[PDB]
Design a protein around this ligand. Structure first.
Ligand SMILES: O[C@@H]1[C@@H](O)[C@H](O[C@@H]2CO[C@@H](O[C@@H]3CO[C@@H](O)[C@H](O)[C@H]3O)[C@H](O)[C@H]2O)OC[C@H]1O
Length: 189
């Protein structure tokens, strides 16, 4: 079980963050693999990928994702200047994170339509500390736990719609959870 933070494991960047509540076990495995097992967690997000990400990376993932409650499986990352937290959501649990959010378009990529949304976080944790930032979402209609994500299709569609990204910070395949339980085992490349 790993200490919250960032680093490198078996050639891949990882980031694992939680809110301190307890109930999450994040582990790094061989190559691009990571696992998450959680039981009555707080808020958390962790996984493997790259630091920094790029605006045209093709990201592959495969494995198992078994949430019980509020959780997502995504390509997850940040930009700076502007500060943006973004999600290309491939699967989720009890909650579609776009519920009640303003829909900003659609994009077709990697075998599914995705619906695009923007939300905002005010005075919240971020890669630079407490800050205000928009969140950009592409939410896959056809849920899956394996596939490839052509990130450029999302970032280009977001830009077309007026959702600008700054300089890329980290970019991972991640499990997000919010006060839920589950298990997952995911391999990135
Ligand atoms: O020590 C600092 C780290 O703790 C910090 O890590 C980031 C803190 O914000 C995290 O983003 C939240 C993740 O969960 C989502 O549900 C929320 O919307 C976000 O607010 C992010 O994942 C962490 O990387 O980085 C800076 C360090 O100085």
């Amino acid at each position: 079980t790993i200490q919250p933070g960032t680093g490198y494991n078996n050639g891949y960047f990882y980031s694992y963050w939680n809110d301190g509540h307890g109930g999450v076990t994040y582990t790094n495995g061989p190559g691009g693999q990571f696992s998450v097992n959680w039981s009555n967690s707080g808020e958390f997000v962790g996984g493997k990928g790259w630091q920094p990400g790029t605006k045209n990376k093709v990201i592959n993932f495969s494995g198992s994702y078994n949430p019980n409650g509020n959780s997502y499986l995504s390509v997850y990352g940040w930009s700076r200047n502007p500060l943006i937290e973004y999600y290309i959501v491939e699967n989720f649990g009890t909650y579609n994170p776009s519920t009640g959010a303003t829909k900003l378009g659609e994009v077709t990529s990697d075998g599914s339509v995705y619906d695009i949304y923007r939300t905002q976080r005010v005075n919240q944790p971020s890669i630079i500390g407490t800050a205000t930032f928009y969140q950009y979402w592409s939410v896959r209609r056809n849920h899956r736990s394996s596939g490839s994500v052509n990130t450029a299709n999302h970032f280009n569609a977001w830009a077309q719609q007026g959702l600008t990204l700054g300089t890329m910070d980290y970019q991972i395949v991640a499990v997000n959870g919010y006060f839920s339980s589950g298990s997952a085992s995911i391999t990135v490349s």
